[PDB]
């Protein structure tokens with residue numbers, strides 16, 4: 001009760017101050033919110049700790065981030081760059097996987113350990129990227145729409161990979177029955193959202209038995225995140241689709257301001273909890289810094305190349321910007337590593353290498369993405 | 385993760401539909417939100433269960449309800465009816481306590497069991513009352529301001545009583561050292577809020593190192609709820625004070641719409657969880673319905689009389705309206721009963737009698753308060 005209310009106060013207070021600090025320094029505001037969590041968490045002040053309640057609030061924040069981002073995104077404008085989104089997603093899976101596997105072989109790993117290394121680099125965690133895009137007011141640009149589209153397909157691809165790795169870790173074989181169930185559920189869910197995108201215009205919510213348009217919008221957004229999560233997709237993918245279902249009507253029922261209000265409250269908790277979780281090891285382990293630095297470079301270059309090649313139609317600046325946006329990694333990578341520990345294919349030093357990579361690809365993305373965006377925008381202006 | 389996201393969806397969905405239903409029936413919308421929780425909870429559909437995460441979200445909703453209510457309330461307008469707020473609060477403690485104790489003696493209870501019965505009737509839980517006042521747009525009226533003021537003092541009085549009952553249940557004696565620590569912390573907290581009410585005008589938040597006015601407002605609101613809770617006061621008392629600190633500046637930094645957005649999201653979860661918790665016993669126990677009905681009548685009449693006598697300066701209609709608003713009971717009553725079980729002063733049938741009273745005073749208040757308000761407003765109009 002009171003404990004958890006104090007914790008939230010310390011997070012919001014710290015995140016408000018560090019946001020102000022990073023604004024005044026013209027650095028990415030979202031990195032301030034992460035630092036805030038580091039400061040109040042167990043690494044230093046010890047006022048906030050890992051817990052179930054805070055982590056669920058963190059999850060709601062991410063959901064309302066991408067729910068808000070969906071609101072500002074026409075589906076049709078995603079479809080306009082669908083072929084690029086798709087390419088960016090598949091190459092962003094293949095290339096980091098290949099580089100990770102070949103590097104594994106290079107450093108004496110056996111076959112299965114090498115495959116696990118490669119698969120741990122495959123999934124994008126687009127939350128911090130979407131926050132930056134929103135922060136800089138470029139959600140409507142083509143590199144932004146390619147990123148968001150690629151993130152959705154990358155999450156389907158990520159779940160396929162997760163399902164296969166789960167099966168191998170448990171049964172030792174590829175569980176195609178399980179894989180296909182999840183592909184089916186996924187493409188049906190996504191494809192059905194594209195169809196339900198229509199009913200929102202073709203039926204006004206006067207005749208709908210709800211307390212308010214907003215109340216309807218909130219139930220829909222959370223429900224879509226909920227349905228995504230029950231399939232095994234990330235909740236932020238459902239939230240994003242949920243937002244896009246409502247984008248059409250966002251002005252009419254004045255949805256942007258209240259949903260942005262709620263994001264303003266919870267999304268800082270999301271990024272602050274990233275900080276709270278940061279384990280400032282390994283300094284004791286020496287091989288973790290060498291292989292972990294190289295794996296991080298490979299993880300980043302794989303995504304940066306995927307974006308570059310798949311989005312090259314928009315130019316080198318936009319395409320590298322797309323690539324950087326896909327670089328941050330997250331939970332799916334850690335889970336794969338952990339399932340690898342259960343399968344005997346991964347050791348604790350390999351785990352820490354993946355953890356190291358997850359942390360620094362996450363911190364990397366905003367620092368590269370802010371100036372890359374400015375660089376892309378400068379070019380647009382010079383071409384008039 | 386996914387489980388809890390599904391649960392929230394079911395609550396919001398049900399609460400949105402039942403809100404619509406109670407609006408179309410001209411019944412209190414907040415009772416719809418409670419019914420919603422009953423329907424989706426274990427009593428029927430079983431889609432939602434009691435849990436830590438949901439209960440903390442419920443708590444945040446109540447906080448943002450009273451935080452919003454504070455925003456619409458000038459401290460000066462509370463002070464204008466301070467003498468009535470104070471009287472209403474003390475009589476609303478004394479009278480239900482006396483009636484409960486004398487009725488206890490009447491039905492064969494011993495001394496200590498009788499005192500515990502009386503003390504269980506003492507505390508107001510103003511959440512559902514404040515929701516109704518807000519719903520009907522009468523937060524500025526004098527009966528509303530007396531209710532809110534009386535609720536704050538009633539929470540201090542409630543904590544005194546709780547602290548004494550805690551001591552008796554543990555040590556068998558009145559722990560005056562503990563009582564006075566808490567009175568000191570309480571009046572200092574409240575009194576200090578009245579002083580900090582000034583600094584908000586006398587210092588603009590340009591020079592403040594925060595990401596945004598809203599972000600500052602959110603940290604302040606939660607922090608005040610947090611500080612209240614750490615003292616042992618209800619978080620909604622801190623939230624209410626937090627809101628009042630910002631009322632002055634609500635228009636200038638446009639705080640009303642975003643804080644209302646957040647209330648719209650979480651407050652329905654609060655009142656829906658009330659429903660989820662409802663245990664539709666006792667039907668098997670026959671004495672619970674007879675003594676529980678009488679205790680509920682006594683609990684209501686005690687508060688209704690306290691409001692009537694302490695607010696009589698506003699007229700019979702406003703004063704009865706004040707009295708009804710103070711009638712709903714809650715957690716402090718159940719805790720007292722439970723501490724009574726530990727002290728040997730309370731039995732399970734007495735507990736169920738208190739539980740019965742908590743439930744029906746809570747459901748009672750909106751049904752009486754809506755027409756009483758209309759009745760008071762009709763009188764104002766007829767006097768012109």
Ligand SMILES: CCCCCC/C=C/CCCCCC(=O)OC[C@H](O)CO
Pocket residue numbers: 185219220223224226227230231393
């Ligand atoms: C229109 C807004 C969307 C509201 C969502 C409605 C609730 C449905 C969820 C039922 C339970 C999970 C659904 C599901 O697809 O299951 C797939 C797993 O593999 C097994 O649970």
Ligand SMILES: CCCCCC/C=C/CCCCCC(=O)OC[C@H](O)CO
Pocket residue numbers: 072134135136137139140260263264265267268595
């Ligand atoms: C054609 C219209 C232009 C593109 C769409 C418009 C986007 C609107 C959203 C404003 C968000 C800017 C501030 C922000 O990112 O806040 C992030 C969290 O709330 C935490 O503070």
Ligand SMILES: CCCCCC/C=C/CCCCCC(=O)OC[C@H](O)CO
Pocket residue numbers: 055125127274277278279329330331358359362
């Ligand atoms: C239930 C156990 C904890 C789950 C949280 C997983 C993260 C742990 C490691 C430190 C932070 C790494 C960056 C990161 O995870 O960000 C990804 C976004 O938060 C998706 O939730």
Ligand SMILES: CCCCCC/C=C/CCCCCC(=O)OC[C@H](O)CO
Pocket residue numbers: 023026029135136137138373374375377378
């Ligand atoms: C949005 C990128 C377009 C910039 C065009 C080329 C160079 C000019 C200035 C860019 C500097 C980065 C923008 C920035 O600081 O973000 C605003 C904080 O989030 C709000 O405090």
Ligand SMILES: CCCCCC/C=C/CCCCCC(=O)OC[C@H](O)CO
Pocket residue numbers: 009569603604607608610611614615
């Ligand atoms: C201006 C907004 C208010 C922010 C609140 C700042 C944080 C302070 C809390 C420290 C721990 C509890 C404080 C306290 O009064 O203790 C009383 C108990 O009896 C013992 O914890």
Ligand SMILES: CCCCCC/C=C/CCCCCC(=O)OC[C@H](O)CO
Pocket residue numbers: 211456518519520521523524644647648649651652
């Ligand atoms: C002088 C100004 C008049 C008095 C103060 C104005 C009050 C403004 C708040 C509007 C609230 C009405 C709707 C409502 O109660 O919603 C409750 C939850 O959000 C759940 O839906």
Ligand SMILES: CCCCCC/C=C/CCCCCC(=O)OC[C@H](O)CO
Pocket residue numbers: 439509511658661662663713714715742743746
């Ligand atoms: C931690 C254990 C559960 C705590 C919740 C206490 C309520 C239980 C009984 C059923 C509902 C009675 C009405 C009621 O409690 O409302 C009071 C407002 O919710 C204050 O939180």
Ligand SMILES: CCCCCC/C=C/CCCCCC(=O)OC[C@H](O)CO
Pocket residue numbers: 407410413519520521522757758759761762
């Ligand atoms: C606010 C009380 C002033 C009423 C004056 C005397 C009689 C006229 C009509 C009162 C009926 C109750 C008001 C009401 O239904 O509330 C509005 C829903 O909350 C919004 O759907």
Ligand SMILES: CCCCCC/C=C\CCCCCC(=O)OC[C@H](O)CO
Pocket residue numbers: 177178180181184185
């Ligand atoms: C009828 C709606 C029930 C609520 C949940 C949504 C619908 C289906 C739930 C899970 C049933 C199995 C999924 C499926 O269709 O694919 C089966 C694989 O391809 C066999 O390997």
Ligand SMILES: CCCCCC/C=C\CCCCCC(=O)OC[C@H](O)CO
Pocket residue numbers: 183184187188
């Ligand atoms: C490269 C192109 C990518 C396209 C991916 C296509 C995936 C499959 C489509 C799913 C269509 C619905 C199937 C269905 O309703 O149920 C399938 C039975 O029940 C499983 O046994």
Ligand SMILES: CCCCCC/C=C\CCCCCC(=O)OC[C@H](O)CO
Pocket residue numbers: 206207208209401405
């Ligand atoms: C099947 C058992 C019957 C009991 C209730 C369950 C069935 C459906 C939900 C009732 C919801 C009531 C509001 C409603 O849907 O009507 C709204 C108008 O279209 C607009 O006036």
Ligand SMILES: CCCCCC/C=C\CCCCCC(=O)OC[C@H](O)CO
Pocket residue numbers: 561562564565568569
């Ligand atoms: C200096 C600020 C520390 C942070 C928390 C706020 C201040 C005081 C914390 C608890 C100290 C005891 C409370 C008190 O002053 O009263 C003592 C009884 O009257 C003795 O029975």
Ligand SMILES: CCCCCC/C=C\CCCCCC(=O)OC[C@H](O)CO
Pocket residue numbers: 567568571572
């Ligand atoms: C009927 C009138 C009601 C007035 C209630 C007055 C309660 C007490 C005032 C508290 C003033 C601050 C005292 C303080 O700072 O510390 C007190 C030492 O440390 C305790 O040993």
Ligand SMILES: CCCCCC/C=C\CCCCCC(=O)OC[C@H](O)CO
Pocket residue numbers: 017021590591592593
């Ligand atoms: C004591 C150790 C020093 C390290 C930092 C801790 C001390 C204070 C907090 C720093 C907050 C930075 C922003 C700030 O407060 O300045 C805001 C201007 O008044 C407006 O320009």
